[PDB]
């Protein structure tokens with residue numbers, strides 16, 4: 001896993017995507033809103049993003065994955081959405097270290113963690129992290 005070090009979350013995501021795009025058959029796109037993410041939660045969100053992308057590339061057999069990062073004042077929203085085959089989260093969740101670790105990173109930063117994956121809907125991961133105005 002890449003590490004952010006000096007970079008903002010947005011910059012880390014964009015740089016990772018640049019590298020991935022050269023190697024992978026899925027189209028990987030980002031929609032990153034320009035706003036300051038609190039330094040304290042950036043690493044956690046980057047670790048979630050990397051796992052979500054990894055799972056999409058390996059497991060979805062889709063053609064496109066989108067990473068979105070939006071500011072909604074009281075919270076930020078991180079969404080990773082693919083158009084692939086989907087899976088049953090319940091069947092996998094408790095035996096799955098990747099999913100369990102994303103959920104734990106979210107908890108550590110006080111954020112919700114949701115996975116919506118249905119046969120015709122692909123897989124969508126959403127994390128809403130609180131922001132203090």
Ligand SMILES: Nc1ncnc2c1ncn2[C@@H]1O[C@H](COP(=O)(O)OP(=O)(O)O)[C@@H](O)[C@H]1O
Pocket residue numbers: 055056059060082084085086087092096097098099100123
């Ligand atoms: N985006 C996705 N599309 C389809 N299947 C997925 C996706 N993400 C996870 N899965 C399924 O959930 C399982 C558990 O995910 P994870 O805990 O990350 O395990 P892995 O080590 O296999 O990446 C995967 O093996 C795969 O079957």
Ligand SMILES: [Mg+2]
Pocket residue numbers: 051054055098099
């Ligand atoms: Mg995984």
